[PDB]
């Protein structure tokens, strides 16, 4: 009965950089097959416009602000991570008889208690930090040189990958390696006789921009060097997905597996991405920062060849997966999303008359976003709040706040109300950021929620 | 054996605005009956000079500073409240076989976990915020208009009352409605065969100043408009108390019930109150802010026709009620008051040689108060500490700090010692207040405890 | 089988002020006997360069920064202390069948929950604060005068000593009294038939500088008044140790007891100490502040007549004692030291390629220290980081940072990484210190970890 679940998350994948979500230049046949025989989502949102807090939200089902995880972890390492008392969806599923696997990027804490194996994943194969260099032939010599020199703070992008806490010596381009271990994970799952949960966290197409020549060779008409490199990186993810689907079919897992494919946040335009038709990109509270491609694939359950047009949150995956797995959630987990399945099946808005938030901190102020029904409220760059009918003005060109004053004020005040149980950040991505936070009396919600 | 307990709390009731505590113009016959056949308290103190933290202290038996509840909750709503790990007196009594009821004003959190029904009250009938408009005929149309317009942040003074989480349509003037449900609560209690605890939290005579014509008609010689309205509001509370006593007598509950009547803080002089002979009023650390009327009534147990002249704290009610109920308290609850009954029965000071504190935060500084034996230390308006022999100088006219230097310094240093386990505020009543707190490096206890 | 353990800690004992660690003027025959038949440590470090946080670290096995105890407790008293959820080594040993005793200075909280008897000591005889006056004849009349005057905030240096919460009337010079009760403790231990742990926390030679004439008489060639007084104070500790060893031999405990003797921090040069050949003293992150004398004595187990030359931390005592006692440690205790015994027995560095830290907060900035293998990194007085080859430059005269840039930067970045799970201080030693902390947006780790 109970389905296997695969959550595939690309890292900094631009909105228009898969074929099912409008790519004209990058070609993603295998990812598009899953979209063509499943349902894609035109209004899918992550809980934060960059990696660490977005991933924290995927795993915990909570806005990262509620659990002190509003910032990326310190870039040079730390002994902190996403709080251990917020149960990960993997742990919940593992407690309900799932064989659990995590692959690739973690970015949620690298201490013993924060490690994938202590957050409910039986299997982990990957790198624990914010990304990685893609070619072992490049990074392994650099790590050797630095380690032999006696350095202990070695940049996490060149450190060896690990398998369940034991270091390995990777031989393949990282995207191919993660795809290979996805196949290995689902092949191991055959014998288990319970259902499985796989969290596949590709670092592609996140920087550094490094692609195989064989992949870049498939895009001879992309003349921009970065865009061709980026295209090659995305194509490697597509090959990977193809290799995984192959294995699922061989093992007779394909038909009873829910596959979710998405990005952790918007594309970085200066590093090869395209977020058309959305404004801006990674880190923004404009749509381009936190509105992402998403597809569901599960034959006979997810309708084939459809596009779901109502708002869905990455926060919804926790209770949705939980309900589909027959795993009970507790009220004291304070889940911020909803089980979207009943509304999804009726082609209705699972967040009818309810807001979806983004709140991204900057130096001495915060940018914010509110999506509810047709409306997108926007607080950016210390401008006054703006309002867009996002259903007809997806690119956020036509501020209609002047003619909907009471509605806008109401949305902002509800966000203000929501903000009070946000915890003080438990860390920042740089030491100076934490010092500035304190110096600036943050959060400056007097500015953020001013109407 | 074990007595029923009723805690009646008026909201912003002035010190001289009941007959038993010296009113010459407002007439409160039923409240005065309870005083005449019981004991009133000339030196009764609440733990904070305004609502939210005072109520937090009544329920938890802790100074609100110890539990992060030094401020009123955000006026436009929030998902925060008085910490769930500080057990409410209602919860303790409920755990020891009491049928528990709360009526009227809450002001201690409106989330599911902070709701009266989750803080140990079997029955709740009231409004969860800081107050309410008094006439359904006035507020219900306003709420209809706003709700039909699609507004979600609706001012809590016009929102519908509820009964155990289900919304109701109130038909009576709020003070009469709460009195009616007090009767209903004690009538329900007859069948239960356990003792009962009723927390009756009238919003009268708190703003808005709104009275029935029939009540105002009883004060033809009060020419000041606000004072007449206020008098009418207090008279409605007296009628209510009378209606409740009536029901207690009918049910044979009267003789074995401990009735406590008090205010949550001092009267607001600009909104109809009189705190004679005390200086200042609501929010002050002068006596007028946190010294309140109080009576106990319990035939054969509380002496009849007496006035107890020693300091008593609202903090004492938790362990006193607990002891009278045979409910065990634990050392790790960190109760800040004392079981006052043994000293009360011997007509001795239950806080002999021990301080009672007030500490009220302002913009960039704090006002403070210390009551111990005959002495009142006062820190106000960024003036140097003052000292009064409050037994001979109740109006705080004669600063004798110059001639008791060592005593004053000693009292202040003991308060400074007490301040270290005060928690940072978990919320503020406005966003800007919290920003100013952070900007001003609060608490500025270098100013507050300077000698 | 399992050994008794005695941890003797002098308070502000200078580096060169015992004979085994190079004293030419102070003579410490009994302490030197333990060194001569045991192993002394040339590179022994406490976790903080002053009392409260150093002691917190000894007892918890954690850097005090991890548990909010980076500052001394408020000098005029408080209701805070070292967190009750960090299990004390005494509690652990008590749970593993040890008879436990603490003597003399506590300085880790004086509330019921923070009291020695609630932190795993069966016996406590001493004073709970930061120090004490040494002559009962002097302090007892002062305390009587103040107590009879009705003062409640009485300076903790004159308050009566206590035995398990009950006040006593001490008749001897405090150092002699503590020594006497050490004898009484080990005599009580004879009957118990389990092993024992004694924590002997002398306040000597900490201020006030007060010595017996009979002790000062032994140093006729010390002409400096303070140095002679200080010498006499240290000699009283030596007599005490001699009296204790006497009792251990009488009771047949000597041979199966591990005796550790050390200081809580470096000597205060302006109050009689000598830290030769180390730079600076008490409170500094120069070697003189946190590098201390230390000896182990345990016949047949600790080699006799040796000097161990590798870094050892006071943090190591918790897991080392635990392992020697057969007491299990849990991963979730987050111990910061190591069981040094296996490396110690092989004459190898128990902190090979691993740092030992000091981080001491000042007004608006922090001083820091890193010891790893031959290297000492130093951050002091808001100067740029310095680096010394501490093995050939113990006095920190020759900054070689210019020629080891990459190593120094790497060490600092590793400290920066370590800093993220440091908690905000739960208290300060003065109210103004806490206000300045907040005003200065502390910690200013942007300055501290700048390279
Ligand atoms: O004032 S501050 O607060 O401190 O900082 C600025 C601003 O105020 C911040 O609020 C803002 O926030 C950003 C968001 O959260 C943290 C900030 O950056 C995040 O995105 C990260 C992404 O930019 C980064 O990409 C890096 C580049 O490629 C990989 C990463 O490291 C590389 O550089 C290294 C180099 O340092 C080393 O010495 O040599 C290496 C050689 O291989 C390498 O160079 S390279 O490989 O040739 O490129 C590049 O800079 O990745 C991180 C994750 O690791 C973040 O991505 S993600 O995880 O968020 O998806 C957010 O956008 O930042 C302001 C300035 O930091
Ligand atoms: O500027 S700040 O830093 O943010 O704060 C200032 C200062 O620094 C603070 O120390 C000080 O603290 C005060 C104390 O705690 C919070 C502050 O106010 C508290 O008292 C509250 C009480 O004033 C308030 O009364 C209001 C008036 O009557 C009812 C309440 O709302 C009314 O107005 C509404 C109106 O806004 C709405 O649009 O229409 C309604 C219907 O027309 C209604 O109008 S009405 O017809 O007049 O009723 C009035 O303004 O009630 C709250 C509880 O609900 C507090 O009372 S109590 O719970 O504490 O007993 C404390 O004194 O605040 C400074 C800035 O105010
Ligand atoms: O208040 S501040 O302006 O913030 O303090 C400043 C600095 O900013 C701050 O960093 C520094 O911190 C000192 C450090 O920790 C607290 C401060 O004092 C400690 O040492 C103490 C001894 O000096 C004190 O000795 C006193 C002396 O003899 C006995 C004591 O009282 C007598 O009256 C006499 O003055 O004893 C303390 C323990 O009781 C403590 O000693 S301990 O070994 O640390 O316990 C330490 O250096 O303080 C600056 C100004 O004070
Ligand atoms: N396991 C040990 N304790 N080894 C250290 C040497 C022990 C040896 N008996 C000695 O006293 O020198
Ligand atoms: Ca990303
Ligand atoms: Ca009030
Ligand atoms: Ca010391
Ligand atoms: Cl710190």
PDB file of N, CA and C in Angstrom, chain B residues 81-106:
ATOM      1  N   UNK B  81       2.439  33.843  24.117  1.00  0.00           N
ATOM      2  CA  UNK B  81       1.674  33.923  25.345  1.00  0.00           C
ATOM      3  C   UNK B  81       2.508  33.512  26.532  1.00  0.00           C
ATOM      4  N   UNK B  82       1.869  33.516  27.699  1.00  0.00           N
ATOM      5  CA  UNK B  82       2.522  33.192  28.956  1.00  0.00           C
ATOM      6  C   UNK B  82       3.041  31.770  28.861  1.00  0.00           C
ATOM      7  N   UNK B  83       4.317  31.535  29.235  1.00  0.00           N
ATOM      8  CA  UNK B  83       4.921  30.228  28.941  1.00  0.00           C
ATOM      9  C   UNK B  83       4.148  29.023  29.465  1.00  0.00           C
ATOM     10  N   UNK B  84       4.000  28.009  28.610  1.00  0.00           N
ATOM     11  CA  UNK B  84       3.197  26.818  28.906  1.00  0.00           C
ATOM     12  C   UNK B  84       3.792  25.922  29.981  1.00  0.00           C
ATOM     13  N   UNK B  85       5.090  26.065  30.244  1.00  0.00           N
ATOM     14  CA  UNK B  85       5.744  25.300  31.299  1.00  0.00           C
ATOM     15  C   UNK B  85       5.624  25.948  32.700  1.00  0.00           C
ATOM     16  N   UNK B  86       5.024  27.145  32.811  1.00  0.00           N
ATOM     17  CA  UNK B  86       4.648  27.696  34.127  1.00  0.00           C
ATOM     18  C   UNK B  86       3.199  27.307  34.422  1.00  0.00           C
ATOM     19  N   UNK B  87       3.018  26.294  35.267  1.00  0.00           N
ATOM     20  CA  UNK B  87       1.696  25.739  35.527  1.00  0.00           C
ATOM     21  C   UNK B  87       0.766  26.768  36.165  1.00  0.00           C
ATOM     22  N   UNK B  88      -0.401  26.961  35.546  1.00  0.00           N
ATOM     23  CA  UNK B  88      -1.419  27.891  36.054  1.00  0.00           C
ATOM     24  C   UNK B  88      -2.079  27.294  37.291  1.00  0.00           C
ATOM     25  N   UNK B  89      -2.440  28.152  38.242  1.00  0.00           N
ATOM     26  CA  UNK B  89      -3.177  27.732  39.435  1.00  0.00           C
ATOM     27  C   UNK B  89      -4.444  26.941  39.073  1.00  0.00           C
ATOM     28  N   UNK B  90      -5.108  27.320  37.986  1.00  0.00           N
ATOM     29  CA  UNK B  90      -6.260  26.580  37.498  1.00  0.00           C
ATOM     30  C   UNK B  90      -5.919  25.144  37.111  1.00  0.00           C
ATOM     31  N   UNK B  91      -4.792  24.962  36.426  1.00  0.00           N
ATOM     32  CA  UNK B  91      -4.316  23.631  36.034  1.00  0.00           C
ATOM     33  C   UNK B  91      -4.013  22.790  37.268  1.00  0.00           C
ATOM     34  N   UNK B  92      -3.332  23.387  38.247  1.00  0.00           N
ATOM     35  CA  UNK B  92      -2.994  22.697  39.498  1.00  0.00           C
ATOM     36  C   UNK B  92      -4.253  22.242  40.237  1.00  0.00           C
ATOM     37  N   UNK B  93      -5.214  23.149  40.382  1.00  0.00           N
ATOM     38  CA  UNK B  93      -6.483  22.823  41.028  1.00  0.00           C
ATOM     39  C   UNK B  93      -7.256  21.771  40.230  1.00  0.00           C
ATOM     40  N   UNK B  94      -7.271  21.895  38.901  1.00  0.00           N
ATOM     41  CA  UNK B  94      -7.915  20.898  38.024  1.00  0.00           C
ATOM     42  C   UNK B  94      -7.303  19.512  38.206  1.00  0.00           C
ATOM     43  N   UNK B  95      -5.977  19.463  38.303  1.00  0.00           N
ATOM     44  CA  UNK B  95      -5.262  18.223  38.608  1.00  0.00           C
ATOM     45  C   UNK B  95      -5.586  17.675  39.996  1.00  0.00           C
ATOM     46  N   UNK B  96      -6.002  18.540  40.921  1.00  0.00           N
ATOM     47  CA  UNK B  96      -6.463  18.100  42.240  1.00  0.00           C
ATOM     48  C   UNK B  96      -7.982  18.117  42.385  1.00  0.00           C
ATOM     49  N   UNK B  97      -8.677  17.663  41.340  1.00  0.00           N
ATOM     50  CA  UNK B  97     -10.107  17.378  41.390  1.00  0.00           C
ATOM     51  C   UNK B  97     -11.016  18.618  41.403  1.00  0.00           C
ATOM     52  N   UNK B  98     -10.530  19.798  40.998  1.00  0.00           N
ATOM     53  CA  UNK B  98     -11.422  20.972  40.883  1.00  0.00           C
ATOM     54  C   UNK B  98     -12.076  21.080  39.494  1.00  0.00           C
ATOM     55  N   UNK B  99     -13.367  21.394  39.490  1.00  0.00           N
ATOM     56  CA  UNK B  99     -14.076  21.849  38.300  1.00  0.00           C
ATOM     57  C   UNK B  99     -13.705  23.318  38.113  1.00  0.00           C
ATOM     58  N   UNK B 100     -13.140  23.659  36.956  1.00  0.00           N
ATOM     59  CA  UNK B 100     -12.507  24.955  36.752  1.00  0.00           C
ATOM     60  C   UNK B 100     -13.191  25.769  35.667  1.00  0.00           C
ATOM     61  N   UNK B 101     -13.325  27.067  35.930  1.00  0.00           N
ATOM     62  CA  UNK B 101     -13.972  27.989  35.008  1.00  0.00           C
ATOM     63  C   UNK B 101     -13.270  29.326  34.936  1.00  0.00           C
ATOM     64  N   UNK B 102     -13.163  29.867  33.723  1.00  0.00           N
ATOM     65  CA  UNK B 102     -12.636  31.202  33.498  1.00  0.00           C
ATOM     66  C   UNK B 102     -13.660  31.996  32.715  1.00  0.00           C
ATOM     67  N   UNK B 103     -13.855  33.257  33.091  1.00  0.00           N
ATOM     68  CA  UNK B 103     -14.834  34.100  32.434  1.00  0.00           C
ATOM     69  C   UNK B 103     -14.261  35.458  32.122  1.00  0.00           C
ATOM     70  N   UNK B 104     -14.606  35.951  30.937  1.00  0.00           N
ATOM     71  CA  UNK B 104     -14.286  37.300  30.539  1.00  0.00           C
ATOM     72  C   UNK B 104     -12.898  37.400  29.958  1.00  0.00           C
ATOM     73  N   UNK B 105     -12.114  38.331  30.487  1.00  0.00           N
ATOM     74  CA  UNK B 105     -10.852  38.746  29.876  1.00  0.00           C
ATOM     75  C   UNK B 105      -9.755  37.735  30.168  1.00  0.00           C
ATOM     76  N   UNK B 106      -8.962  37.435  29.140  1.00  0.00           N
ATOM     77  CA  UNK B 106      -7.831  36.518  29.259  1.00  0.00           C
ATOM     78  C   UNK B 106      -6.522  37.297  29.252  1.00  0.00           C
TER      79      UNK B 106
END
